From Swiss-Prot:
Subunit structure: Component of some HBO1 complex composed of KAT7/HBO1, MEAF6, ING4 and BRD1/BRPF2. Component of the MOZ/MORF complex composed at least of ING5, KAT6A, KAT6B, MEAF6 and one of BRPF1, BRD1/BRPF2 and BRPF3. Interacts (via PHD-type zinc finger domain) with unmodified histone H3. Interacts (via PWWP domain) with dimethylated and trimethylated 'Lys-79' on histone H3.
Tissue specificity as recorded in UniProt: Highly expressed in testis.
Organism: Homo sapiens (Human)
Location of cross-link Glycyl lysine isopeptide (Lys-Gly) (interchain with G-Cter in SUMO2): K41
Main function: Scaffold subunit of various histone acetyltransferase (HAT) complexes, such as the MOZ/MORF and HBO1 complexes, that acts as a regulator of hematopoiesis. Plays a key role in HBO1 complex by directing KAT7/HBO1 specificity towards histone H3 'Lys-14' acetylation (H3K14ac), thereby promoting erythroid differentiation.
Subcellular location, record wording: Nucleus; Chromosome
Transmembrane segments: none
Whole sequence portion shown: 555 to 674 of 1058
Recorded superkingdom: Eukaryota
Encoding gene (name): BRD1
Domain Bromo: 9-113
Protein name as annotated: Bromodomain-containing protein 1
Disulfide bridge partners, by residue number: none
Amino acid sequence: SMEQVAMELRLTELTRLLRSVLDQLQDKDPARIFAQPVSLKEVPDYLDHIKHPMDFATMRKRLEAQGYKNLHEFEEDFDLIIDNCMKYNARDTVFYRAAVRLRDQGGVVLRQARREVDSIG
């Protein structure tokens, strides 16, 4: 149907906007602390601590299969990145501090992305 096509076009345009949002958020992590999944080889107990692991590469895989239906979904995954890190790692660590900075800086980007996703529908 033409309706299904139009919905697909909206999903594709969301996907384009989210790809740019993701690049901007990832630039707020120049150390690349959140680039890849936490390794179970190097933190074998990780899944006893954190129930839903997340990282930028896993987000990117989901994005390229057009797997985010809305911004809410994508923000949930970004928040998991930050929130997981702040629970697993102590306050006095390079990891925790990197999450705080990503949260603070990413907040700016997400504030306007919410307006762009509303605004362009």
